[PDB]
Every structure is written in structure tokens, then in C-alpha cells.
Design a protein around this ligand. Structure first.
Ligand SMILES: *C(=N)[C@@H](NC(=O)[C@@H]1[C@@H]2[C@H](CN1C(=O)[C@@H](NC(=O)C(F)(F)F)C(C)(C)C)C2(C)C)c1cncc2cccc(F)c12
Ligand SMILES: *C(=N)[C@@H](NC(=O)[C@@H]1[C@@H]2[C@H](CN1C(=O)[C@@H](NC(=O)C(F)(F)F)C(C)(C)C)C2(C)C)c1cncc2cccc(F)c12
Lengths: 306, 306
């Protein structure tokens, strides 16, 4: 038992991180087979970064303008192209550590692991959720651009995020690995800002089930509620609506604990209306919404990855 | 910016995990050079686990009683011995993925990364602290014994923990890699229980500095206090004493933020006496004590590891 913010083992991704330099800018790239993926804003100067025409900027670049460092070994760049907001740098060596992989795009409310990197060197791993407003609450400093987010399905790495920028509130924005931004953000210096967020209701319910599995039961009650009446309370507290599909997804956790989904909804309603009155749930005095039902089953049942 | 519970990249440790089977028991081992380390209780039967004499139990074992699985490859065991509460299984192949490593023992209040494993296969990575009562609040299921905790110093893995058991409150106990238990726990089924814990004061102060660095300032005040008068309040709230050495260790964070250590102590006193009044700090409604000053500097300044 116990319940932790748990990331996937990062080894398979560590073997893919490289350093990409163009001009005076250094950031991280992802080396898979003979291609290195990195944010296209690597080619921008400080004054380019204001209002850039990336097609113009890239046509003025040459293969030799891109220095790629794979540990302490040069990679020779033999081609370059732009795909949406990422650059694809063709190199003359296929990464011998290429894992099996997929490029997937995730949904708000889904989670993933982030391998924070600097100068092509991994520094730490942590778990994030894609917020409903398409930002992530990451931990990123200067030089972290090009770090990637991913999930692992058994032996296959599903890359879902590459880091591009920090918004003024300290949250983070980036793209999928096809270079398409999550949310209404652009790789150019505007006054862009996150905009309103909501709490991920189905995840809060999953985490309440995790708590019951780990012996926290004080918030339970004999009460129940209807889905419609629950959603009336959810909207009032900036929670997003609970669908019948969410209820179905919570089925296994409901069966394991013997607590019907709509009963756990009744418990959530009371927590929203009354607060916690000095008590905690799984070491938190807040309702936690960055664990999916899958994350809870993974950790309160025990699947590995090879 | 941002602040996350961040673990070290796990790749170097993933390459060392193997599966160890003896009789009907399967657990994890750590393969370094030509030795595999695992909990000695692997050799116990269910009824052995009650009150065992490990010297007797081990003399009745043979090399061939130990099956070691390195992925999908047999390792032949060519010797076995006991060192305190761990077994050392000599094998006929040195692990080609052995990183540079050290066996270190950590202090209560220090942090480390845990690579949770099952059947020799890594499943997730997360960050823990050694509690003052020598337990860790981990996330571990059946089969997780032999999973290890570690820190990374630059390119060198300092192994500090191997998992042995879950206590009745759901917290976890284990040994250093010399097989010496952290705390007053034994690898045999008694009624042993965690016993009283305290909050790690210097870590709470470090995390308050992290919050200031990330723009949370509402808890600051013009107030100050003396170390002696602070420690009077700390003891009343089950916080452990703050020493002059802790104050010195917080020096860099104090200089970076311009907030004197004893001023931040005054802020902590008020938070302990008044609570937070509906507000949060770095996404928490509790005072967090599992980040060390080093963890804060690492994440709010940005060191990598190669
Ligand atoms: C990546 N290493 C770095 N981010 C960028 O280089 C990124 C690119 C231009 C500036 N920028 C960026 O994040 C801006 N933010 C904005 O322009 C925004 F508010 F989002 F609109 C700041 C430098 C002011 C943070 C692009 C294309 C926008 C990066 C990544 N992660 C965290 C960082 C923290 C601090 C400084 C950085 F440069 C950071
Ligand atoms: C490791 N895979 C497993 N733990 C053990 O096998 C461990 C060894 C005997 C029983 N045991 C153990 O953790 C007991 N706990 C106790 O005896 C205690 F309360 F600590 F005194 C329980 C099986 C009742 C949990 C030894 C030498 C004590 C293990 C590891 N981590 C989590 C687990 C959760 C559930 C079941 C396990 F077997 C767990």
C-alpha cells in the first residue's frame, strides 16, 4: 500500500536525449532512429522571437548551422525540415538505443511522465497532468525546452509532449511530437496567458477510491446522489461535468471497494460543501485531481513494464 | 519555475534489477558486477517467517536453490553468503550495465528516489524521505521487496535503501545496502509498529523558500524571532529542533531570496499557530517536509547528472 505521485521508469527516454545548438541557443532534442526532434524556436534570435516568420528563418539556415551533441559525440546533421512547431534534423547515425515508440496526443485530464533535461542531460523525472486549459504545471528552468513527456505501455514509449515555453503564471505549454500545440499557445512572444482552468472531477473520484483502498474512510457516508444532482454541485465549484462514461470507467474501482460510484459522488459533494475540517486524505488537505483511474489501478494493483 | 516532487532519472538503476526466486518466493535483486543483492528473507517459508534462525536456514540452502532472472536470461549462481539482513548471490556473469556506484547510508530527513519493481521489472519511480522514525512513506505491493532507493551524484549512483517489509500503518521499512536496518525493525513477523514521528523542520523552511522563489509570498511578514524562541514553538507542534547548522545550510536560499532564516522561522511560527486560512503554498494546504535544502536548490537553480 501507500500512494505516491509515480512516474514511469525513464531509462528508455534517457537514451534518446541529445543537445541541439543553433547560434547562441542551446536546448534539448529527441533522437529516434536517424532523426532529432526539437522545438523550432531554436533557430530564432532574441529579436526574431518577437514576431517570427519561421519559413523565412529556416530557409536562411544550413545543415551546418545545427550542432547536435549525443553525450560526448558529434552527430553530423545531413538534412533539416520543419513540421508544424518542431524541427526534424536528419542525422547520419541511427540511435542504437531507439526504443519501440509511438507519437500519441493526449486529452486534458490524462497524465504523463516528464524527463526534465538540460544540455541534453536528464536531470529529473516527475508526473504531470494535462490541465483542462491545455497547460501543464511542470518544473522547468532555462534550457529545458525540448524535454519530453511520455507514457510506457509495457515495452513501448508513447511520446505525448515536448516542452516549448513558460507562461507568465509559471505554468508550461508545448506540443505533441508532430509539433502541434496543446491549447491556444504560439511559439512567439505575445502577452499570451493560460486562461481559466477547472478541476478534473473523474480524477478526484479515482483518488478518493485510492484513499479507501489505502484505509482512509472518514469521508464516506450512507448518502447517495443522482448524476444530474451531482453535476449541479460540480459546476458550482468549478469542477468539470461527470459523464456516464466516467462512471463506467470508475467501475472496477467501485467493485474493488464495494462503494458505488454515485455514493462516492455523494461523498465528494459533502467534501466540496463542508471542506475537510482539519483532516487529510492520502497526506493531502486538498482534493487531488492529477491521478487518473488507470493510475490508481496501476498503483493499487501493480502492473510493470518491460 | 514550478516545483514538483522530482526523482532522479532511473535508467542507471533499471539496468541492475533482476528477479530472484527461492522456493515459492519471488522478489527483486540488485545486480552489480558479479553479485546479486536481495533481502535475506527470500529463503524463508511462511512458517519460517514467524521466528527464523537465518544462519540455520541458509546453511540448509544450496547455490542451485537460487534462480536469478536477468530479463529473459538465466544467471548461474556460483556462491551465496549472508551479510546482515541481505543475501549476496555470487553469479558467473558481471553486469555489463553496472554504473559507477557507492553504498551509502542516509540520515532521517534526507531524501532519495525509489525504483519500485516486481518480478525484476521496474514499474515506477518516485521520491521519498527517510522519516525521523526511520520509516518511509512508500508505495509498495506484494513482490516489491528488493526494490532499491538511491541518489545520483553526477554520474555515480549512491544506493541507500533496499525494501524489506510493510508495517501495519502502511509505511515501509528496509535496510541500507550493507543489510543494516533503518530503525528498530527486524525481518521476522512480530507486532512491530512504526512509533512516533515528527515533522522535519529544516525541510519545511527549505520548501517555504522554494515557494518564495516561485512567487508565493503571502505568508511572509516583517516579524522576526530568535532561534531559541522558535524552537519553543517547534517542540509544541511536534516539529523537530532547528540547529545553527540547519540555519547555515539554509544560507544560500536566504541570500537568493533576501529573507533571513530567522525571518522565515517567524513566518513558520505564524503558520503553525494560525494555519493557512484557506490559502495554499506550492499547491499544498499542508506544510511539506520532504524536500531538503539541496532538493530546493537543485530544482530552483538546475543541476543535471551525467
Ligand atoms: C526553454 N528553454 C525556455 N523557453 C523558451 O525559450 C521560450 C521560447 C521563447 C521565449 N520562451 C519562453 O518560455 C518565455 N515565455 C513566453 O514567451 C510566454 F510567456 F510563454 F509567452 C520566457 C523566457 C519569458 C519564460 C518561446 C518560443 C516563447 C524555458 C522553458 N521553460 C522554462 C523557462 C523558465 C525561464 C526561462 C526560460 F527561457 C524557460
Ligand atoms: C515484499 N515483497 C513484501 N514483504 C515481505 O515479504 C515482508 C517479509 C515478511 C512479511 N513481510 C511483510 O512486509 C509483512 N509485514 C510485516 O511482517 C510487518 F508488519 F512489517 F511486521 C506483510 C506481508 C504483512 C505486509 C518480512 C521479513 C517481514 C511486501 C513489501 N511491501 C509491501 C507489501 C504489501 C503487502 C504484502 C507484502 F508482502 C508486501
Amino acid at each position: 500500500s501507500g500512494f505516491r505521485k509515480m512516474a514511469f521508469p525513464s531509462g528508455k527516454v534517457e537514451g534518446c536525449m541529445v543537445q541541439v545548438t543553433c547560434g547562441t541557443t542551446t536546448l534539448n532534442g529527441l533522437w529516434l532512429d536517424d532523426v532529432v526532434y526539437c522545438p523550432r524556436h531554436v533557430i530564432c534570435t532574441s529579436e526574431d522571437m518577437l514576431n517570427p516568420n519561421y519559413e523565412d528563418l529556416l530557409i536562411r539556415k544550413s545543415n551546418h548551422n545545427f550542432l547536435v551533441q549525443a553525450g560526448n559525440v558529434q552527430l553530423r546533421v545531413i538534412g533539416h525540415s520543419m513540421q508544424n512547431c518542431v524541427l526534424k534534423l536528419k542525422v547520419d547515425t541511427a540511435n542504437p538505443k531507439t526504443p519501440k515508440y509511438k507519437f500519441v496526443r493526449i486529452q486534458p485530464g490524462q497524465t504523463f511522465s516528464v524527463l526534465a533535461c538540460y544540455n541534453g542531460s536528464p536531470s529529473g523525472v516527475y508526473q504531470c497532468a494535462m490541465r483542462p486549459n491545455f497547460t501543464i504545471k511542470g518544473s522547468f528552468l532555462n534550457g529545458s525546452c525540448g524535454s519530453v513527456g511520455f507514457n510506457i505501455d509495457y515495452d513501448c514509449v508513447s511520446f505525448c509532449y515536448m516542452h516549448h515555453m513558460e507562461l507568465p503564471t509559471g505554468v508550461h505549454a508545448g506540443t505533441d511530437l508532430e509539433g502541434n500545440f496543446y491549447g491556444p499557445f504560439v511559439d512567439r512572444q505575445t502577452a499570451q496567458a493560460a486562461g481559466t482552468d477547472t478541476t478534473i472531477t473523474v480524477n478526484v473520484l479515482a483518488w478518493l477510491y485510492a484513499a479507501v483502498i489505502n484505509g482512509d474512510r472518514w469521508f464516506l457516508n450512507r448518502f447517495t446522489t443522482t448524476l444530474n444532482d451531482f453535476n449541479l454541485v460540480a459546476m458550482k465549484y468549478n469542477y468539470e461535468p461527470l459523464t456516464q462514461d466516467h462512471v463506467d470507467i470508475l467501475g472496477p474501482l467501485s467493485a474493488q471497494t464495494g462503494i458505488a460510484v454515485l455514493d462516492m459522488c455523494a461523498s465528494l459533494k459533502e467534501l466540496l460543501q463542508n471542506g475537510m475540517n482539519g483532516r487529510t486524505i492520502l497526506g493531502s488537505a486538498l482534493l487531488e485531481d492529477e491521478f487518473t483511474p488507470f493510475d490508481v489501478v496501476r498503483q493499487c494493483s501493480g502492473v510493470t513494464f518491460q
